[PDB]
Design an enzyme around this catalytic site. Sequence first.
Site, PDB file in Angstrom:
ATOM      1  N   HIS F 202      43.632  27.902  52.777  1.00 37.06           N
ATOM      2  CA  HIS F 202      44.778  27.145  52.304  1.00 37.06           C
ATOM      3  C   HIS F 202      46.011  27.395  53.156  1.00 37.06           C
ATOM      4  N   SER F 206      42.731  22.233  55.820  1.00 38.67           N
ATOM      5  CA  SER F 206      41.566  21.666  56.472  1.00 38.67           C
ATOM      6  C   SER F 206      41.847  21.308  57.923  1.00 38.67           C
ATOM      7  N   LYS F 228      36.575   9.553  47.362  1.00 40.75           N
ATOM      8  CA  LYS F 228      35.620   9.593  48.459  1.00 40.75           C
ATOM      9  C   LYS F 228      34.484  10.584  48.174  1.00 40.75           C
ATOM     10  N   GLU F 272      10.302  30.448  51.790  1.00 42.52           N
ATOM     11  CA  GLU F 272      10.761  29.087  51.571  1.00 42.52           C
ATOM     12  C   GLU F 272      11.333  28.487  52.855  1.00 42.52           C
TER      13      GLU F 272
HETATM   14  C1  HEM Z   1      28.877  28.026  48.082  1.00 41.06           C
HETATM   15  C2  HEM Z   1      29.000  27.759  49.363  1.00 41.06           C
HETATM   16  C3  HEM Z   1      30.227  27.065  49.806  1.00 41.06           C
HETATM   17  C4  HEM Z   1      31.097  26.225  49.144  1.00 41.06           C
HETATM   18  C5  HEM Z   1      31.062  25.760  47.701  1.00 41.06           C
HETATM   19  C6  HEM Z   1      32.061  25.819  50.100  1.00 41.06           C
HETATM   20  C7  HEM Z   1      33.115  24.933  49.797  1.00 41.06           C
HETATM   21  C8  HEM Z   1      34.041  24.503  50.743  1.00 41.06           C
HETATM   22  C9  HEM Z   1      35.052  23.539  50.505  1.00 41.06           C
HETATM   23  C10 HEM Z   1      35.259  22.769  49.214  1.00 41.06           C
HETATM   24  C11 HEM Z   1      35.784  23.429  51.661  1.00 41.06           C
HETATM   25  C12 HEM Z   1      36.961  22.495  51.862  1.00 41.06           C
HETATM   26  C13 HEM Z   1      36.369  21.067  52.053  1.00 41.06           C
HETATM   27  C14 HEM Z   1      35.420  20.923  53.235  1.00 41.06           C
HETATM   28  O1  HEM Z   1      35.805  21.099  54.418  1.00 41.06           O
HETATM   29  O2  HEM Z   1      34.214  20.599  53.120  1.00 41.06           O
HETATM   30  C15 HEM Z   1      35.239  24.311  52.631  1.00 41.06           C
HETATM   31  C16 HEM Z   1      35.784  24.478  53.903  1.00 41.06           C
HETATM   32  C17 HEM Z   1      35.220  25.445  54.749  1.00 41.06           C
HETATM   33  N1  HEM Z   1      34.139  26.232  54.551  1.00 41.06           N
HETATM   34 FE1  HEM Z   1      33.030  26.252  52.999  1.00 41.06          FE
HETATM   35  N2  HEM Z   1      31.836  26.431  51.261  1.00 41.06           N
HETATM   36  C18 HEM Z   1      30.745  27.192  51.158  1.00 41.06           C
HETATM   37  C19 HEM Z   1      30.065  27.940  52.102  1.00 41.06           C
HETATM   38  C20 HEM Z   1      30.558  28.096  53.390  1.00 41.06           C
HETATM   39  C21 HEM Z   1      29.900  28.723  54.457  1.00 41.06           C
HETATM   40  C22 HEM Z   1      28.518  29.354  54.430  1.00 41.06           C
HETATM   41  C23 HEM Z   1      30.789  28.691  55.522  1.00 41.06           C
HETATM   42  C24 HEM Z   1      30.633  29.262  56.877  1.00 41.06           C
HETATM   43  C25 HEM Z   1      29.564  29.882  57.388  1.00 41.06           C
HETATM   44  C26 HEM Z   1      31.964  27.995  55.150  1.00 41.06           C
HETATM   45  C27 HEM Z   1      33.033  27.866  56.020  1.00 41.06           C
HETATM   46  C28 HEM Z   1      34.014  26.964  55.683  1.00 41.06           C
HETATM   47  C29 HEM Z   1      35.055  26.648  56.661  1.00 41.06           C
HETATM   48  C30 HEM Z   1      35.302  27.239  58.047  1.00 41.06           C
HETATM   49  C31 HEM Z   1      35.802  25.701  56.072  1.00 41.06           C
HETATM   50  C32 HEM Z   1      37.012  25.035  56.684  1.00 41.06           C
HETATM   51  C33 HEM Z   1      36.457  23.780  57.350  1.00 41.06           C
HETATM   52  C34 HEM Z   1      37.576  22.834  57.680  1.00 41.06           C
HETATM   53  O3  HEM Z   1      38.142  22.162  56.773  1.00 41.06           O
HETATM   54  O4  HEM Z   1      37.849  22.673  58.867  1.00 41.06           O
HETATM   55  N3  HEM Z   1      31.769  27.654  53.850  1.00 41.06           N
HETATM   56  N4  HEM Z   1      34.173  24.970  52.031  1.00 41.06           N
HETATM   57  C1  HEM Z   2      23.205  29.857  43.907  1.00 43.34           C
HETATM   58  C2  HEM Z   2      22.652  29.784  42.708  1.00 43.34           C
HETATM   59  C3  HEM Z   2      21.199  29.886  42.551  1.00 43.34           C
HETATM   60  C4  HEM Z   2      20.166  29.662  43.442  1.00 43.34           C
HETATM   61  C5  HEM Z   2      20.219  29.234  44.910  1.00 43.34           C
HETATM   62  C6  HEM Z   2      18.986  29.925  42.694  1.00 43.34           C
HETATM   63  C7  HEM Z   2      17.710  29.848  43.256  1.00 43.34           C
HETATM   64  C8  HEM Z   2      16.542  30.044  42.512  1.00 43.34           C
HETATM   65  C9  HEM Z   2      15.238  29.818  43.008  1.00 43.34           C
HETATM   66  C10 HEM Z   2      14.868  29.359  44.411  1.00 43.34           C
HETATM   67  C11 HEM Z   2      14.380  30.064  41.983  1.00 43.34           C
HETATM   68  C12 HEM Z   2      12.903  29.891  42.078  1.00 43.34           C
HETATM   69  C13 HEM Z   2      12.658  28.535  41.351  1.00 43.34           C
HETATM   70  C14 HEM Z   2      11.212  28.142  41.125  1.00 43.34           C
HETATM   71  O1  HEM Z   2      10.515  27.845  42.121  1.00 43.34           O
HETATM   72  O2  HEM Z   2      10.660  28.091  39.993  1.00 43.34           O
HETATM   73  C15 HEM Z   2      15.110  30.423  40.816  1.00 43.34           C
HETATM   74  C16 HEM Z   2      14.493  30.801  39.635  1.00 43.34           C
HETATM   75  C17 HEM Z   2      15.311  31.177  38.588  1.00 43.34           C
HETATM   76  N1  HEM Z   2      16.678  31.233  38.545  1.00 43.34           N
HETATM   77 FE1  HEM Z   2      17.916  30.787  39.922  1.00 43.34          FE
HETATM   78  N2  HEM Z   2      19.296  30.269  41.424  1.00 43.34           N
HETATM   79  C18 HEM Z   2      20.611  30.295  41.273  1.00 43.34           C
HETATM   80  C19 HEM Z   2      21.378  30.586  40.150  1.00 43.34           C
HETATM   81  C20 HEM Z   2      20.825  31.088  38.980  1.00 43.34           C
HETATM   82  C21 HEM Z   2      21.587  31.540  37.900  1.00 43.34           C
HETATM   83  C22 HEM Z   2      23.100  31.550  37.820  1.00 43.34           C
HETATM   84  C23 HEM Z   2      20.731  31.928  36.918  1.00 43.34           C
HETATM   85  C24 HEM Z   2      21.218  32.474  35.638  1.00 43.34           C
HETATM   86  C25 HEM Z   2      20.335  33.301  35.130  1.00 43.34           C
HETATM   87  C26 HEM Z   2      19.406  31.730  37.431  1.00 43.34           C
HETATM   88  C27 HEM Z   2      18.258  31.930  36.745  1.00 43.34           C
HETATM   89  C28 HEM Z   2      16.998  31.669  37.314  1.00 43.34           C
HETATM   90  C29 HEM Z   2      15.761  31.900  36.509  1.00 43.34           C
HETATM   91  C30 HEM Z   2      15.689  32.406  35.067  1.00 43.34           C
HETATM   92  C31 HEM Z   2      14.711  31.592  37.322  1.00 43.34           C
HETATM   93  C32 HEM Z   2      13.222  31.711  37.042  1.00 43.34           C
HETATM   94  C33 HEM Z   2      12.628  30.552  36.273  1.00 43.34           C
HETATM   95  C34 HEM Z   2      12.201  29.530  37.292  1.00 43.34           C
HETATM   96  O3  HEM Z   2      11.481  29.762  38.288  1.00 43.34           O
HETATM   97  O4  HEM Z   2      12.617  28.394  37.152  1.00 43.34           O
HETATM   98  N3  HEM Z   2      19.523  31.200  38.684  1.00 43.34           N
HETATM   99  N4  HEM Z   2      16.446  30.419  41.185  1.00 43.34           N
HETATM  100  C1  LIG Z   3      39.427  24.684  43.331  1.00 44.88           C
HETATM  101  C2  LIG Z   3      39.497  24.650  41.812  1.00 44.88           C
HETATM  102  C3  LIG Z   3      40.914  24.534  41.246  1.00 44.88           C
HETATM  103  C4  LIG Z   3      41.430  25.875  40.748  1.00 44.88           C
HETATM  104  C5  LIG Z   3      42.420  26.450  41.756  1.00 44.88           C
HETATM  105  C6  LIG Z   3      41.701  27.472  42.604  1.00 44.88           C
HETATM  106  C7  LIG Z   3      42.211  28.812  42.116  1.00 44.88           C
HETATM  107  C8  LIG Z   3      42.872  29.475  43.300  1.00 44.88           C
HETATM  108  C9  LIG Z   3      44.354  29.476  43.004  1.00 44.88           C
HETATM  109  C10 LIG Z   3      44.929  30.877  43.136  1.00 44.88           C
HETATM  110  C11 LIG Z   3      45.230  31.215  44.591  1.00 44.88           C
HETATM  111  C12 LIG Z   3      46.726  31.159  44.818  1.00 44.88           C
HETATM  112  O1  LIG Z   3      46.927  29.843  45.304  1.00 44.88           O
HETATM  113  C13 LIG Z   3      48.215  29.642  45.840  1.00 44.88           C
HETATM  114  O2  LIG Z   3      49.003  29.014  44.835  1.00 44.88           O
HETATM  115  C14 LIG Z   3      50.287  28.536  45.239  1.00 44.88           C
HETATM  116  C15 LIG Z   3      50.823  27.818  44.008  1.00 44.88           C
HETATM  117  O3  LIG Z   3      49.788  27.614  43.017  1.00 44.88           O
HETATM  118  C16 LIG Z   3      50.168  27.637  46.486  1.00 44.88           C
HETATM  119  O4  LIG Z   3      51.461  27.310  46.981  1.00 44.88           O
HETATM  120  C17 LIG Z   3      51.619  25.972  47.486  1.00 44.88           C
HETATM  121  O5  LIG Z   3      51.977  25.073  46.438  1.00 44.88           O
HETATM  122  C18 LIG Z   3      53.244  25.227  45.767  1.00 44.88           C
HETATM  123  C19 LIG Z   3      53.448  23.947  44.943  1.00 44.88           C
HETATM  124  O6  LIG Z   3      52.191  23.295  44.680  1.00 44.88           O
HETATM  125  C20 LIG Z   3      54.441  25.561  46.688  1.00 44.88           C
HETATM  126  O7  LIG Z   3      55.369  26.405  45.990  1.00 44.88           O
HETATM  127  C21 LIG Z   3      54.078  26.317  47.978  1.00 44.88           C
HETATM  128  O8  LIG Z   3      55.114  26.100  48.944  1.00 44.88           O
HETATM  129  C22 LIG Z   3      52.699  25.976  48.567  1.00 44.88           C
HETATM  130  O9  LIG Z   3      52.297  26.929  49.558  1.00 44.88           O
HETATM  131  C23 LIG Z   3      49.406  28.367  47.595  1.00 44.88           C
HETATM  132  O10 LIG Z   3      49.268  27.547  48.761  1.00 44.88           O
HETATM  133  C24 LIG Z   3      48.037  28.769  47.078  1.00 44.88           C
HETATM  134  O11 LIG Z   3      47.361  29.586  48.028  1.00 44.88           O
END
Ligand code: HEM
Ligand code: HEM
Ligand SMILES: CCCCCCCCCCCCO[C@@H]1O[C@H](CO)[C@@H](O[C@H]2O[C@H](CO)[C@@H](O)[C@H](O)[C@H]2O)[C@H](O)[C@H]1O
Lengths: 61, 54, 55, 71, 244, 383, 124, 85
Positions: F202, F206, F228, F272
Amino acid sequence: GKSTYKIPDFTPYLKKDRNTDANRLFSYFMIGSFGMLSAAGAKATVQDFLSNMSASADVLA
Amino acid sequence: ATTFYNVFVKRNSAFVATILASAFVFDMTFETAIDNFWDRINAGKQWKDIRHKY
Amino acid sequence: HLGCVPIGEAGDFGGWFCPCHGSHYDISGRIRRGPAPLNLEIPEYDFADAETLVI
Amino acid sequence: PDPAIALHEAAAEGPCHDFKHHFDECVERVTKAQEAEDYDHAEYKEDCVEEFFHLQHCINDNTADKLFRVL
Amino acid sequence: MTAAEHGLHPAEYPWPQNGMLSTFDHASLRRGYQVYKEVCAACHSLDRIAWRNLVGVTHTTDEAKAFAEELEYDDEPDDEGNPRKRPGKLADYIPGPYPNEQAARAANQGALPPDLSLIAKARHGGADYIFALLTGYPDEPPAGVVLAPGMNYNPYFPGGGIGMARTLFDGVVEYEDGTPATTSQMAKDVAAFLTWAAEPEHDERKKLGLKAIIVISAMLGLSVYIKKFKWSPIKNRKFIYNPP
Amino acid sequence: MALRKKNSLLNMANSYVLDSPQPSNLNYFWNFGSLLALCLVIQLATGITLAMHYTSHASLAFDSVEHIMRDVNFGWFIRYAHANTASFFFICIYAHMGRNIYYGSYKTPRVLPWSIGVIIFLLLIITAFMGYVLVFGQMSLWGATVICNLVSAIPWLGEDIVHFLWGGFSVGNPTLQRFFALHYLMPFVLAVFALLHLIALHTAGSSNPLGITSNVDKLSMHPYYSFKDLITVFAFLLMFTLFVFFSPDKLGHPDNYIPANPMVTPASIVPEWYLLPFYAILRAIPDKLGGVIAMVAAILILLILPIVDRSIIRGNAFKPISKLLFGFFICNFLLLGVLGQVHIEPPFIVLGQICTIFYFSYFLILLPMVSTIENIFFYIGSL
Amino acid sequence: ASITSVVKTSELILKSPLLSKIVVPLAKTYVKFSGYRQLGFKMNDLIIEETPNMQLALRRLPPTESYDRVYRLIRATQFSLSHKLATGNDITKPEEDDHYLIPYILDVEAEAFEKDALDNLEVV
Amino acid sequence: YMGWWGHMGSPPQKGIAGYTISPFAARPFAGVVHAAIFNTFRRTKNQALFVILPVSFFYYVWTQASEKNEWLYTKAGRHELAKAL
Ligand code: HEM
Ligand code: HEM
Ligand SMILES: CCCCCCCCCCCCO[C@@H]1O[C@H](CO)[C@@H](O[C@H]2O[C@H](CO)[C@@H](O)[C@H](O)[C@H]2O)[C@H](O)[C@H]1O
Ligand code: HEC
Ligand SMILES: CCCCCCCCCCCCO[C@@H]1O[C@H](CO)[C@@H](O[C@H]2O[C@H](CO)[C@@H](O)[C@H](O)[C@H]2O)[C@H](O)[C@H]1O
Ligand code: FES
């Protein structure tokens, strides 16, 4: 090019009937349909998903 | 169009009420429609189609 | 090979014969013929007494 | 009787004839080789599994749809 | 690996259930249950299937209750704590032929016949593999194949030597619906039945999928219109620059 | 002042989802971030629901999964949703990482969100690996065995560490129960790191596909990117629907429908699909410890991209040679994936080694050289 | 890499007759295929600016050069989001692709690097 | 490196006039057919090599490797397999 009072050409995009109720109503129909399918989809999703917590087939047996 | 806009769209409370009521109708009618269509494309195959023999 | 239990005393090297894919183990339980790559694994065992082993 | 029997025979004599002949020739060779003595103490014993697979794969390609049509 | 080590790959047969919108043929499921019961059940269990599972799929409530009631199941001990038996109920699982693995292996020259409840999902090929295997025992093994004793040649089985002999022969079953019980017909029916046993949600799942596809597609189309509508002021923006 | 700005809690949400200033030219590859958030939400919802019906004891685990499939209302859907969304999570994460590498998102001033991102990726791998064990089918057991035995390579203490992880002398009940507890935990840790990398981002905002500043031309996150994001949400849900309802087992291994048997070894033990490239890299090095180091290095080497990219320009949109190199790097990564699931046979053994050398030489040689030369071509070419 | 580095290496090449004979034509095609001119950019508009040195160089641009750069960035952003290319006078012609920023960044870096050297002086 | 609305961190802007029209006044799908055909063709043509060259190279490598592997495990490939191991 220089004068800022000469608005750039928007004729390729402008609708002639832009101020009419029919014009707005169409866009709200699209928004409304989307809201409607989102509501029906959410309801279906929530109902089917939460039903996992009701007595399973082996328990009802 | 003015009338329709003024009654169902202008107030968001009315717009949301219309959307939700439509979703209710959609859900019930879509269910019935798909059920019938599914039964036609899978005719003679389902338990309901052979049940009468038993 | 895959993990069936060889029928002992049978074989062609008169030790153990796995009926599954026809692998023959010896009196050392060494693989002689068939798909099996290795000799039958030895666990970690010690003779605590001369009359009792622990595995 | 089993419809498959007729379909398989027809496919072997027809669209899969090249493969049928390959399998046949293989069988002839292997049987003759088994007939010869000191075969048991040979390094490489040829089978006909490969040729069999080529034939069966071909028969299945030409029969699968036809067979299920008559069940 | 050699092709023999892999096993021959089964043909793709046109199953009734192949097809995004297609259910199982329930008449084939019922016939397949009869093949299971009269042929396979001598050596193979179906332990994950309860009598209630047949109801409204292959059988009515009464037919399935009758099948259950013919069997005896272990009851709770009596008042002196001695063992008792009871007749079966719809909640009971279909009982297997053997009491334990050791008994199963002793009856099958060392081999353990797998439980068939998940076999259609536990093998590459599914129904096609079951059909190909049951109908794919050649009269004679290809010249040069040496079978271990009590092994049977089947090209679909990896390695070629399977401990299960051919079991389906024309007329081993007399179907109750008058269908000619040929090897092919019985293999097709039992493969369909086993597929159902592995995935009994199949019919419902595909219908719910059709509803989801329709709704999600509509939502996707509308979301494109709405995105374009909202973005048009940004896309249509124009500039005039007069350098200061 | 508007409440959304005045109230501190509302203002935090406001800053991330509503008034957040975005570049006006993000393309569809900026949508993977919200898809990853969607996968995370689906996994939490379906995972917590599965936990209500699953039993972690080795005597009951596999059967509890069958009970979910057969008896629990919509259990089949919840299970298939969870298993398929695990694959979609990796497709989205590879896309998101590929976006980041192509557009230079790792460059200053975004080194911190990128570095935390690399850890998110390691947490996702561990989470998915432990979840796969929970089924306790054949692939579950034998995959746990082979992967956990890599720890035996740690010198001196490795064997002790393995027995400590297993809670016994092989993969069994203690291992399964601890994997359940950690599999439940790890997604929460992952959500925290995902939040951390966004807070780190932040400060710079981006990046954008042109690689230039967007401080000149910002758009509110809402409504523009909210609407979008809906397009790709619905596209994702269509792909989800096709797998979950029409082909729920396409991405799985049939052997996981056979209950774990420590005696019988499956024909081929592979991870996998999404772990396959790292498995190919491990096989390439003949030494056990060497292979483990190489495999970990293959992920940790992402941390040096900020250094080895010597370009004065952010991202590849205007760099023809960098774009060619990136294309070869990506296709090589896919080939490593394929080689991860072939048999250890000629000629795939040597091919795996060549592809592994190419993988590392991208970071260590090619990117530093190409980025140096392109700097000179931009300068001379525009004189 | 620093602009100083890039400029010095480039000058070594431009000096060598052989090297320039083979490198200059390559560099010109590279720039043509790069395609930044088709979004109305000048090369220097692409240089990473989120660094103290670059922020200082940009602050030292003459006001007119600075206003024109802002317009080129806004215009390029609008082409990017529309998936269009520049046409007509919006395309940067090779003669307009001037290194307006290079002298500023070279002065900023000269001082920054001299400061680093002098921070490590040893009285002899 | 980023501020917030009102102090985003832009160099001073002067001399640019920006114009746009309401979403309700515009046709959102204006020029869609031209875009879908001609714009997509242009964009795709200009990026085609960067996809074709690596994909085709690595597919060729795979094809050769998989065909050799298959041949080595036939009867005909016995001798070459023996040398390869
Ligand atoms: C649970 C996995 C992740 C979630 C939910 C997630 C979510 C996001 C989101 C919402 C943004 C801002 C929107 C976007 O650019 O797409 C972002 C930006 C970014 N994420 Fe992730 N991310 C994840 C994993 C990762 C991983 C594995 C990497 C790097 C190895 C990564 C690196 C970045 C970077 C560098 C940005 C900034 C990109 C840019 O806007 O230029 N994230 N991510
Ligand atoms: C990043 C989040 C997660 C990933 C990538 C993930 C991935 C997986 C995978 C690959 C399996 C094997 C599925 C199958 O072939 O049957 C699995 C099984 C399972 N996961 Fe997760 N999981 C996630 C989050 C969670 C969470 C939050 C829970 C909360 C308990 C959970 C509970 C289970 C359970 C109970 C099973 C075994 C039953 C089954 O195979 O369907 N998982 N998960
Ligand atoms: C993604 C799901 C939505 C939930 C929000 C994610 C939780 C993370 C929030 C806590 C982290 C602190 O987040 C921080 O907050 C302040 C105000 O809120 C932001 O501050 C920004 O916005 C405010 C007004 O909007 C201005 O006063 C400031 O000049 C600007 O930098 C920071 O840029 C951000 O880094
Ligand atoms: C009297 C014994 C017997 C009968 C009858 C029998 N089987 Fe089997 N079956 C076995 C044995 C033993 C195995 C294990 C073979 C092996 O692993 O070598 C087996 C294995 C199988 C396999 C698994 C092959 C594999 O890939 O592991 C399937 C599927 C199968 N049987 C289905 C059937 C069906 C369907 C029927 C009858 C309609 C049937 N069986 C009848 C004894 C029998
Ligand atoms: C805040 C939200 C309010 C509370 C949420 C409600 C929780 C659960 C309520 C309904 C769940 C069970 O409700 C029940 O759902 C299932 C579908 O899911 C329906 O069942 C219907 O479809 C299923 C498959 O989709 C078929 O197997 C069934 O034969 C058919 O009748 C029942 O017709 C309905 O009675
Ligand atoms: S399993 Fe023992 S010989 Fe193959």
